[PDB]
Design a protein around this ligand. Sequence first.
Ligand SMILES: CCCCCCCCO[C@@H]1O[C@H](CO)[C@@H](O)[C@H](O)[C@H]1O
Ligand SMILES: CCCCCCCCO[C@@H]1O[C@H](CO)[C@@H](O)[C@H](O)[C@H]1O
Lengths: 48, 443
Amino acid sequence: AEPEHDQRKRMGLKMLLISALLTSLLYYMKRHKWSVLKSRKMAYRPPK
Amino acid sequence: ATYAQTLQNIPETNVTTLDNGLRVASEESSQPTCTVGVWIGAGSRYENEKNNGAGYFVEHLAFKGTKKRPCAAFEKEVESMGAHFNGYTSREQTAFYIKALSKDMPKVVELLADVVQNCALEESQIEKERGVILQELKEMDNDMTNVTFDYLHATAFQGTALARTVEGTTENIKHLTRADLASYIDTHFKAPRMVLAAAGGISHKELVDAARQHFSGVSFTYKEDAVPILPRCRFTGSEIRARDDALPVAHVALAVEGPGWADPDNVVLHVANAIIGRYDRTFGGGKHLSSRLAALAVEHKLCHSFQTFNTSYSDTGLFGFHFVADPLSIDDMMFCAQGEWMRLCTSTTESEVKRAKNHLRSAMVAQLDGTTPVCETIGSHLLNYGRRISLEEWDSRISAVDARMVRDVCSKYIYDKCPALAAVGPIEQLLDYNRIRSGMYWI
Ligand SMILES: CCCCCCCCO[C@@H]1O[C@H](CO)[C@@H](O)[C@H](O)[C@H]1O
Ligand SMILES: CCCCCCCCO[C@@H]1O[C@H](CO)[C@@H](O)[C@H](O)[C@H]1O
């Protein structure tokens, strides 16, 4: 029924690894760029 | 008479040190008029959270009279001799100087010494200047350019001493004590940290003589003759955005950390800044100006003005640019400005530097146009380099600079660095830090 059974699973293995890695790296990058806004501070200094 | 010959034939600058540690330097000319003053290595950077704005408060009393001679007496004496008494206080340097007839160089030196040593600090004058200073802070609060540079330091050196402004805080000015100003003076206005400079028609030996006579008060301990090294000020890539769409134009200042006085690279940075130059809506040159950025500014009406700078200090500095633009042209201006910075690091031309070098030479020669400007050079030079640097040396250094050198040095301080940004006014169009940060590489 599914002659590709074995190959499918070998791919699934690599998919899981690449995904773990890539998701992590991209998570960092997103956090990196957004750190600018995440830690950003502000104040309201109206005149006299 | 060739440029070279004229540079070599310039009278040398004489320096002699007294036992108290003070240094006396001067450049002699044949001018009936002269300028002499004392350049102190003091300023806001030396102050702290409690006495910020003291050196400034002092700068206000330094002319309101001494012990030997109260206000009116002090003023009359100086006025009646046609002498001019000016001075200033900055972040790392203070100065009090007088313009007068060479014929009075000696009386002046006495006056200077009396000002720096015996300031009356009239208890009543203090409360009076307290209100004057408070008015000057409101006047300066409308000076965008200066508000912008203050903010630039406030963030570029956040957490440190260079973050503070020269004038000081409102709380300090409202509570600085007669004792605090006194303490300031005794702590900082000290012989080894001062420089008696003079230029014009004056005898170095007569200058140094009056100097010996009035700048006495030698020190006993070792702690009194040692020049304190200041703690480093950390640079921080960051931004401060003060928005007020009610303001007509917007001011923007971007900068990277600079090397600091003693570093030779400064000659290159100044050449680099010379390539980009500066501009303002009254430069007849218009669309033909050599500075590419200036050309684009004219063609696209990018700004009202812009200017590069390489502000130095003992151990650090701010290398950057500042522009004033309409709320709707900020983005293109910043785009082109950063673009040019990339060009510097990456595609500078021999032609470009050839021009920038000439421009730089005539600029250094211009900062020696009168007795006061020359005197300022001497004071600053000894105070920063511990020795005067001739125009011939500068020219020697400037001459060695080439395109490749500009690229490497510029790449060194600019490329892929995290800048410090200060934006004031109607700044909505100025894109975020991340976008700006990306304009720091490639391109
Ligand atoms: C389910 C029956 C599997 C028999 C083949 C065993 C080899 C499985 O392995 C995979 O097979 C794929 C296709 O043959 C190849 O393209 C892959 O590179 C290989 O790793
Ligand atoms: C987030 C998306 C990640 C995709 C990465 C998956 C890459 C898997 O790659 C595949 O592995 C198979 C197993 O041997 C091979 O037979 C295939 O030829 C190969 O292309």
